[PDB]
Scaffold this active site. Sequence first.
Site, mmCIF file in Angstrom:
data_model
loop_
_atom_site.group_PDB
_atom_site.id
_atom_site.type_symbol
_atom_site.label_atom_id
_atom_site.label_comp_id
_atom_site.label_asym_id
_atom_site.label_seq_id
_atom_site.Cartn_x
_atom_site.Cartn_y
_atom_site.Cartn_z
ATOM 1 N N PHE D 32 6.265 -29.960 7.230
ATOM 2 C CA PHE D 32 6.756 -30.614 8.453
ATOM 3 C C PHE D 32 7.731 -29.682 9.194
ATOM 4 O O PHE D 32 8.555 -29.009 8.558
ATOM 5 C CB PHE D 32 7.398 -31.972 8.068
ATOM 6 C CG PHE D 32 8.211 -32.653 9.164
ATOM 7 C CD1 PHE D 32 9.496 -32.220 9.474
ATOM 8 C CD2 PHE D 32 7.733 -33.799 9.803
ATOM 9 C CE1 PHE D 32 10.256 -32.864 10.436
ATOM 10 C CE2 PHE D 32 8.487 -34.443 10.771
ATOM 11 C CZ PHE D 32 9.751 -33.979 11.082
ATOM 12 N N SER D 98 6.448 -27.541 0.894
ATOM 13 C CA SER D 98 7.273 -28.665 1.348
ATOM 14 C C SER D 98 6.444 -29.972 1.264
ATOM 15 O O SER D 98 5.969 -30.348 0.170
ATOM 16 C CB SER D 98 7.862 -28.347 2.763
ATOM 17 O OG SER D 98 8.862 -29.261 3.223
ATOM 18 N N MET D 99 6.249 -30.650 2.398
ATOM 19 C CA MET D 99 5.448 -31.871 2.434
ATOM 20 C C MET D 99 4.123 -31.729 1.698
ATOM 21 O O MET D 99 3.697 -32.647 0.998
ATOM 22 C CB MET D 99 5.173 -32.291 3.872
ATOM 23 C CG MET D 99 6.012 -33.470 4.317
ATOM 24 S SD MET D 99 5.459 -34.176 5.892
ATOM 25 C CE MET D 99 4.517 -35.587 5.337
ATOM 26 N N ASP D 228 17.761 -22.698 -0.117
ATOM 27 C CA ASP D 228 17.092 -23.825 0.541
ATOM 28 C C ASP D 228 18.111 -24.904 0.872
ATOM 29 O O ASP D 228 18.679 -25.551 -0.038
ATOM 30 C CB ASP D 228 15.949 -24.389 -0.328
ATOM 31 C CG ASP D 228 14.923 -25.188 0.486
ATOM 32 O OD1 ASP D 228 15.337 -25.917 1.415
ATOM 33 O OD2 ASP D 228 13.706 -25.098 0.186
ATOM 34 N N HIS D 257 14.407 -22.617 3.241
ATOM 35 C CA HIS D 257 13.244 -23.516 3.124
ATOM 36 C C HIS D 257 11.988 -22.841 3.668
ATOM 37 O O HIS D 257 10.915 -22.885 3.050
ATOM 38 C CB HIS D 257 13.489 -24.839 3.871
ATOM 39 C CG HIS D 257 12.484 -25.909 3.550
ATOM 40 N ND1 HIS D 257 12.198 -26.291 2.257
ATOM 41 C CD2 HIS D 257 11.697 -26.672 4.351
ATOM 42 C CE1 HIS D 257 11.271 -27.233 2.277
ATOM 43 N NE2 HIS D 257 10.954 -27.488 3.537
#
EC number: 1.11.1.-
Lengths: 441, 441, 441, 441
Positions: D32, D98-99, D228, D257
């Site tokens: 995202f 991530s997502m 992160d 991140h």
Amino acid sequence: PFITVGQENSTSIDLYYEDHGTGTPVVLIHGFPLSGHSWERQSAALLDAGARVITYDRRGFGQSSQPTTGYDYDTFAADLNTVLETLDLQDAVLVGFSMGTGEVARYVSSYGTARIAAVAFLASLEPFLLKTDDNPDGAAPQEFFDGIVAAVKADRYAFYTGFFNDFYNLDENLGTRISEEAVRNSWNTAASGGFFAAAAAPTTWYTDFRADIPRIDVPALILHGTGDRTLPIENTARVFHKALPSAEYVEVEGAPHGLLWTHAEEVNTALLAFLAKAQEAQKQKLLTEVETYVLSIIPSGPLKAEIAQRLEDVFAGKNTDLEVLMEWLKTRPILSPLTKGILGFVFTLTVPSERGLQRRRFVQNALNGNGDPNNMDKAVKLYRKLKREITFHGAKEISLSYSAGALASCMGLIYNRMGAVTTEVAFGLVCATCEQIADSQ
Amino acid sequence: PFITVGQENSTSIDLYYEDHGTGTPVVLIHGFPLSGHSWERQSAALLDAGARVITYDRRGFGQSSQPTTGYDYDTFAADLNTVLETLDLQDAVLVGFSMGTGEVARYVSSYGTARIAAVAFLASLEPFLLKTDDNPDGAAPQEFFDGIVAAVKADRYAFYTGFFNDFYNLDENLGTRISEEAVRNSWNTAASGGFFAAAAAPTTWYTDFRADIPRIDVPALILHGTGDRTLPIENTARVFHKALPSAEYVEVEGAPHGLLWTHAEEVNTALLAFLAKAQEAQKQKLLTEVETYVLSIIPSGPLKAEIAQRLEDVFAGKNTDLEVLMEWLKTRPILSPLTKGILGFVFTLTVPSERGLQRRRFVQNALNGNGDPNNMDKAVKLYRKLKREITFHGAKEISLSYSAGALASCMGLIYNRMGAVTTEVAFGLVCATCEQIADSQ
Amino acid sequence: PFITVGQENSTSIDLYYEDHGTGTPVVLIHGFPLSGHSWERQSAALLDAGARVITYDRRGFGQSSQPTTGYDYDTFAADLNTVLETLDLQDAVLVGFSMGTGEVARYVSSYGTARIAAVAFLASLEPFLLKTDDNPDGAAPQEFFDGIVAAVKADRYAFYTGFFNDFYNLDENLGTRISEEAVRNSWNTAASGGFFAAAAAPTTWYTDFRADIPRIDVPALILHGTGDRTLPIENTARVFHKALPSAEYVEVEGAPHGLLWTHAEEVNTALLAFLAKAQEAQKQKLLTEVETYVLSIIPSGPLKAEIAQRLEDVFAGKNTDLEVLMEWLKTRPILSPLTKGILGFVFTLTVPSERGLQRRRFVQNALNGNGDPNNMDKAVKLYRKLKREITFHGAKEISLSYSAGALASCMGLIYNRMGAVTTEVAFGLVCATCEQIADSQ
Amino acid sequence: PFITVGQENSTSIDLYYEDHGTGTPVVLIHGFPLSGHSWERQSAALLDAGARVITYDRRGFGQSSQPTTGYDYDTFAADLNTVLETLDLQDAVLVGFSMGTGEVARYVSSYGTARIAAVAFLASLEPFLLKTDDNPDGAAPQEFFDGIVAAVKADRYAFYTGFFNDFYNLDENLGTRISEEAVRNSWNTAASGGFFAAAAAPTTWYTDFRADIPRIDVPALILHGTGDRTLPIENTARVFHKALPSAEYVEVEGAPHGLLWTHAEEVNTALLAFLAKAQEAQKQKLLTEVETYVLSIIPSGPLKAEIAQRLEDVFAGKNTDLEVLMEWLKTRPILSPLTKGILGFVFTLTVPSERGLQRRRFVQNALNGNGDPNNMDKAVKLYRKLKREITFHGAKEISLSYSAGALASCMGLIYNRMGAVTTEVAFGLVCATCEQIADSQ
């Protein structure tokens, strides 16, 4: 013969029926604990008087199957419905005796009078036999019927004996109006019904037919024996006539419940009269319908006046000299040869006596489908189907699915006696033809 | 109704049969010279007690065909076999009277007890009627039976009269336990059997059933009248019970051969006592089988303990508060919503009283086939077939041919009363479902 | 997603559209030079408020095709027509912003309000922007618009920058009501529209909508920002309201042209206020229509009075005790069980709270299609189609093509939660059923 | 390119995807608020290293459709499922960032690892981000996520700016590891996702993946940046590795991140190593399976020893003189010419270098289907289907539906370069042939 009306577990439920004579259909619905054969004195008279006689054995009786289900007037009326639909009965008379009068009321009430010309109630259950607060004229209390059930379950064999005693007023009628042998046959018939039906039947006797009666649409006859020990005339026929004032009403003086045998005469004469009144009107209806179709193809004018007058006269039964009639048609100007053939056909068909007159060449030539093989092929096909028809409308309906050439050829086929169909079916054929021809104009 | 059992020359051999009621099948096999209708006092009781009643007429008797072949117990047993296979009878009770007890022994012996839950022998032939060197307890010498054959061939009509005399102990029972009319019906029934069968039947009476008896696998009842003049209780029932100690054994004090009518209540009571025990055992079996299928989908653990305890208790008849049961199920962790719906269904079905509780939303949602139209389409198809089923295994077999989604949807359909089937059929449905779901794991 | 609206040379002309949520359809028509995505602040609110949101990109903008033809309000209105017809929108609200308000007027004017429940005009062009002799209130002379065209053709990229300045009153609103990033996104959207459309759009701005306004048939909203530098409120919204006094009219104090973003909450609130009134009116209409269909099957009389009173009260929102209502229905004389099931269904569906009441047996039994598999088969088929319906009339239309038995079974299926459809679709189902049943009488 | 994953009202829901290179399939699932294109630094490396690269845009992002439904990990995993099934991916590597790491866990967990060779988690959500009583290691309280939703709904455009700040540690990395232009592109990508998805996505972030982790079946990689700011390494990667000790685990020192861009190297080198370890094992598996099929047609003996040794050596990569190999095969006694052709084919296919050697006559003659036109006809038909295959088993399955003559002819067709298929598909063809031939013995 059987008609299947349902299924019970692995077995179907079949009703035994018979189908005798030709003419207007009269359906006889027997009483407890007997079968269609109990009408034999009435059947003979109706057959001699020229009617089609249909009898069947209610489920659990005579030669019908003996299920342990469906002992109630809605099922019994549904059974009757299946019979009428299976045979495609049109313009039928329904005659019930005793239990049978419950079928007549309930069928008319639920299914209507589409197939039905008239009804007759002999030794009726109507309007309600159960004596209650709201039904004061009821013949007996509930405990009384409960009693019969208990008696049949105890012995039914022994039970039938005392039952036929009061059923026939044997103390009065034995050796006189009923023989000992006739009674023996009745017991044998009863003993042959199913055990379960015997005990279950009496529970259907106090069915409330009070809401069925206003539904009676068509001419009716109510007939009862004043010496009826089984269905007291005062709780049944007399209060029923008040509910249906319109009904023709006949009391048989000192006649028992089993008046079909003991007073077959008074029954058969009265029933005969009722059929006779119904039958002539139906015949007139058939005659006048034919006439409109026949007239529809003729040009309006004085000739159309002469033709219509003649139809009406032969239809009224004035036996006319067919030879004179045919020569007149033959020599008429304006009328097409086709039209003359159709009229030629109608007149020979409806005239009281043909007086051994040969077929007319002008008609044979008019109804030959132009000698065309396809016309003739279809006409033979139609003929096959018409052999299976028994009504005017069924015949007319199937005929209208054929071309006019084929229809005319079919008519020639019948005219020339190369095939045969019933009168009303022949009328349907000629009327379909007229309808097709009129529509072309 | 007929079942075809063979061919004789140009004609088939058909047995007349009847098929009444619903529930556990009880097959009644009549005696000489009568028909399936001779059981009418017993049939009524069994029907009221909630059983499926099957009767048929042995070849040569009542309404069955009247061949001149196959008058021997192997053929008679083969005839019975065909009936049982034709109707796909499962878990059936076979009850024979007199001659009928020969069918029961010979069928069990040759074909085994695959379809058969229990047997009953009333006024039995067993174990051997022929008095020989090796059979000292035999009731009569060969010359005695040779005598009956000769008597029937001479007049059978006259013969039936003296036969029913001793058959019923009419000198004792006429006007008392049997009416003159009941006897007249019996003679009529006999007179209606085939001439050839009448003379050939007595030759089958001294069939040696001694090797058939050890084959009797299932619970049995032996019942005899002590006043039996036709089959002396001392040469038949009393030596039969020694050969089968295991059999439940009932003597009817001073009852004649024709004890089905004369002592019909007591005989009916006895049948209820045996049917009642067999029915209770069958019900227990059904509870046990259903339970294993239901438990097969639940994960092993303490919950599975609580669930099984509850099933067993409702199955034993401890009326439980279904409302309490359902809330418990509803609120159980671990169990899938599907599993909870199946259990929900089972409990409402088996609980003694539903106490007018409305259907549960959690079950309706669980058994809706995901609202998928194809599932629902198949579920409706299955439902149609299940309406024709009467047994647990037939139902379960046809159900297993459908997918789990369709099965769950069908269950919802029954749950929600959008359709109806018999209890045992419903059990087969839920068990097929459990089987399918368990197999997916 | 695309809808094809035409052809240009070898290519079709496709409009990009989106279709979100469920409920009453609200169609948002964007302004220059933006796309359907410019409504994102409004879309979110409408989605939360429970509406079906339709957006599309005008030809030449956003993700739609970029032809060099059809830049005029008749084509734009024809484009809109195709969208509405393609989606079969019924009872729709049309909301236009800026350029979009030209579509709303011209479509209503030419095509009428058959699909349209209400209209809304935000930052409107109306009634005519061109300042002429006959149009003194016009906002600018022709030479002024000629100027914009020339400016866009010169650089459109640079042009968008100064345009969004006045579009948003950035001198007032930047960093406050609009972010620099939100403005960057707007420019990107504009830069993404077709070069030809950019220069051709400004020629459509002085379209004379004066003859379109009298055609506005349905409830309307006019909303304008008083700080609108792009469309001076004095030459547009204020003279438009004089032409349509009937319109609900809202001035947003100091709001710029691009008030959808800067004053989005207030605009969203206004939309909710209008949608809320239109929705309430639509709901009332639905209650009124449903009611007539439901009442059509009930016999005229005092009961029909009690029933109608009750419908109206629950329809008005008086939360009634469904348990009390259902018992009353259940115990009503005269009403057929079918009729009681239909009413049962309607009441549980429309009552504010079901209060965790279980489904009623009398309704489940009434709506089971007689447990007939063909009925149920068709009901499942209908259900599949109804899942795809979103309107009362679409649902009712497809339902009327099924028999009453199948319709009743479908209703039971929904009642029992074996399937699910939207409320208005369910209403169409029960109304088709009532229509079919009423027609049988 | 699009894959349709569902329907929303009148529109289908399509995912934008790309499909590049050849070799073992590697599926990259973005984070995202970016798209498949955010993997571009990784895609280039994987393409150079010789893998098939699959990217797709999650619903609501990049070029995928933008519904207002299905924002949850079961739907996202179902979306992924549809992609994998649509492309018939076998032996695939799933890499989530991530997502995307939520898709990887939830798909593996629910659908199993049938298509999946290995998994990789980069900047993971796992195991649960929500800080609760039972989840003490959770990164934040519920109120924190509620906050992000509120912030995105307020402005998403402005929101993306501060988000990319912490996403990339721009205070550290701007002008260094990430350019201002690269960041601008990221914002543009985000601004292009759907408004609804933007606000709905953050609600999926605290999905509890704790029960998914034990389901991870295959080799795994966990990779996280120690700097992160978006997913604190201490609440995510570090507690995740405790839950999956088995995972290979890599900390990127001071990586933010958005480490895919800032530390593409360390990422791509590590990812490369992981692919490299997975890829060689898969290649070995492919080689050894082929060998068993090839050996199955050779008679047991010392020759079968020499042959197997040679296969294994070329399979291990020892570049052998194909000219020497082929002469040896050619001159081998016992081996059928068919067998020699199959081996001839296999060796030229698997040998590291063909060294510009011409095709061998003995092989062309062996694989010519006896020059039979029906064989050749079917071989051409099979070839068409094989062009559409991408896996060994798909190829082998379709090949086994053809006769051995047709299969041999097809092999000749490929051998002679009259057609071309991928290596693994060619292996499936020769293995189906060997299977058919072995079965004939």
